């Protein structure tokens, strides 16, 4: 299963849930996406997050706001 190949299993999980103060956490979002960029299952991860409607967090190389923008 694709979760077996998630490189974020070797990261701090909270890296993928940035919180900003008076604006976007641009740096932390980039830091999370950098891990996704060296992950072999970015597409499966993004597909699962989109198909099951994960609102919060960085999944599949996309921030929460980006996935929200895709959705209706």
């Amino acid at each position: 299963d694709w979760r077996h190949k998630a490189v974020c299993r070797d990261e701090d999980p909270e890296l993928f849930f940035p919180v900003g103060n008076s604006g976007p956490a641009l740096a932390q979002i980039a830091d999370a996406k950098l891990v996704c960029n060296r992950c072999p299952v970015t597409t499966e991860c993004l597909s699962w997050a989109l198909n099951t409607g994960q609102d919060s967090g960085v999944w599949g190389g996309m921030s929460e706001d980006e996935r929200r923008a895709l959705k209706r």
Partner: protein
């Protein structure tokens, strides 16, 4: 079991958020509470409870964490 990752996720929330989730799922005394009861205890709206629950579930289900078979 699931306790370890779930408690780990609860640790990342505020005390109020974690209380809301514990009451919603009945983690502490085995009695899930209604949205009304939770909004009365922690003074939060139904949409805010929805968002707390949604965020917690996304953290729990994120591939960074092993999932429970």
């Amino acid at each position: 079991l699931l306790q370890d990752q779930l408690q780990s996720v609860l640790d990342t929330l505020s005390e109020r958020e974690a209380g809301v989730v514990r009451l919603r799922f009945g983690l502490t005394d085995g009695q899930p509470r209604t949205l009304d009861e939770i909004g009365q205890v922690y003074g939060v709206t139904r949409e805010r409870i929805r968002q707390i629950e949604s965020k917690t579930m996304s953290k729990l289900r994120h591939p960074s964490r092993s999932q429970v078979l």
